[PDB]
Symmetry: C2
Subunit: 348 residues, 2 copies
């Protein structure tokens, strides 16, 4: 154009939609193993079973579907999305590793009041990295934009993990006996449960904003502490199993804490006793207990209270476990309790 004139398009720099798509594709592709083949659509892949059939005597397909839950609402209010991909991935895959399954594929669905490609880019970055850390291929996904369904700015994240375990290696708790030990691996916080409650506690009743802190938090913001990611126990559990640790049973500690989650893996009539003083409780829990005037018993009935995964094995497995655990810096191993004849899970 001739000199001395306004640029017509000045101030509008709007990147072609295909740019974000391509970046997401690059992140997803980083998750692919040799077993992946071209799938359907932009993000679709398939998965060859050839290697699985060769490496397993009697392979069984193990699957689980899970959402993040109201933690997303906290992420939205904080404008902090970078840990949610990890939250979702862990929420789903910890639920199959309790059986000794090796995760193979992942798919995700994210629904939005309004789909914002920048936010989606961050979720895909996180989910892809989470997958890549444990050797899982992200083979497909879907999005939905439904402002009439969702409250303003809200989202819902759902994911599905698929894994393989040899039939004879399924860890079911059948061999658990009185006198076996309960071990546990620390959580980072609330993980993926109890956020509706926490949000109301802090932001409704207490009147906080997410950038506030409390003495328990040593300057860390409530938002940052709440948004720490759900720990993925896949790698440490497989380190144990690959090194010959004889794991009799496991329980992923989610809503309802020890009492709700442990009984699932116990043979008829057997109990468990968990010593609550044998492990550290994350500051966020102690803080909620104080601010919300919640009784200690309700807290332990409700929340993981610092243990995200339990492992049941004989005492003589502890040395090998603790040796192996040292290298995994995202979680800590404790001996927290024991299997009894009590017919109940109790916290003491």
């Amino acid at each position: 154009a001739m000199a001395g004139l306004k640029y017509e398009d000045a101030g509008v720099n709007i990147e072609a939609g295909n740019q974000a798509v391509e970046r997401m594709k690059q992140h997803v592709k980083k998750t692919f193993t040799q077993d992946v083949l071209t799938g359907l659509g932009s993000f679709g892949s398939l998965y060859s079973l050839k290697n699985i059939i060769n490496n397993y005597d009697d392979p069984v397909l193990v699957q689980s579907i899970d959402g993040v839950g109201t933690k997303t609402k906290v992420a939205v209010m904080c404008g902090k999305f970078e840990n949610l991909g990890y939250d979702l991935f862990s929420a789903a895959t910890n639920d199959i590793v309790v059986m000794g399954a090796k995760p193979i594929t992942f798919l995700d669905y994210v629904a939005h009041d309004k789909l914002d490609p920048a936010i989606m880019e961050e979720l895909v970055k996180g989910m892809s990295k989470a997958c890549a850390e444990c050797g899982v291929s992200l083979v497909g996904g879907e999005t939905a934009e439904m402002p009439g369904v969702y409250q303003a700015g809200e989202i819902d994240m759902v994911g599905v993990i698929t894994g393989i375990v040899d039939r004879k290696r399924i860890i079911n708790g059948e061999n658990i006996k009185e006198g076996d030990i309960v071990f546990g691996l620390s959580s980072s916080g609330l993980h993926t449960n109890g956020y509706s409650f926490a949000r109301k506690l802090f932001f409704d009743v207490a009147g906080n904003k997410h950038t506030d802190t409390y003495p328990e938090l040593e300057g860390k913001t409530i938002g940052d502490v709440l948004l720490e990611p759900h720990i993925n126990y896949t790698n440490i559990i497989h380190d144990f199993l690959d090194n010959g640790v004889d794991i009799k049973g496991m329980a992923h500690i989610t809503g309802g804490g020890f009492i709700e989650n442990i009984p699932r893996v116990l043979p008829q009539g057997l109990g468990a006793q968990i010593d609550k003083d044998s492990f550290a409780t994350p500051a966020i829990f102690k803080l909620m207990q104080r601010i919300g005037d919640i009784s200690e018993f309700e807290m332990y009935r409700s929340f993981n209270m610092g243990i995200g995964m339990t492992i049941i094995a004989s005492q003589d497995q502890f040395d090998k476990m603790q040796e192996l655990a040292k290298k995994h810096t995202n979680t800590k191993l404790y001996q927290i309790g024991k299997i009894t004849n009590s017919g109940k899970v109790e916290i003491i």
Copy 2:
């Protein structure tokens, strides 16, 4: 009690390959028979939601067909490559959980699973009050299936002169409900119990809520019985023009004869009320065809013979593959 009825619906989906899982509703799936019956098995998966149809279901208070919708929405997307569905999992999120509703959804999903041999191996519900608008829900489902490597159908062998066949839909299926809801209930100020001349006394709610048809059985009947299918396209949002090109080799196009198949009344109604050109209709809606199948003309005879037993859909010859590079309606 409601949980026991749900467990019974879920159990009805179990094939011999199912093993006990984790939790009330969890199961596992043994691959032994897969490994024995396939040369080179490939695991094929897809995840999808029902979409905005849920809002109409909530408005009508009719959940009978929604669980079936969810299964079909997920499963049809993998049958286009020749995969045989094996397992299903579902996730339902609610503003406020109502167990009577959940039972109805589980009833529908299980029916769809059971009739095609898919085992429902797990699921989850979530109540998230600060997330959903009053009474609203979201439903997600994931299908897993198996295909032999050599038998993957991608459309790569499609050529000019191949025929486009289609299988009838029941209605909008799973797409276009945002438009439908706004057309009928925002603007025309209708209630879901209202009717229109095109509907002959059937309510707008009932016609909208007819279930997304499950094409699993007819497609595998075609495939297992010797129909040489070069490609398929599930007609979902974007109608023929958006969906068909995805399976067409570069430069190829399709011509669809609009008069060759019946269009359900609901589409004619929306066309009139919205004053939408016929041109626009075929670009935005399935217009009566939920699935397209591309094969040579000489496959029609076997297809028609095999289709007879399948009473939930009708087979039509709707068009042909061209060199136009575009999808055109004539």
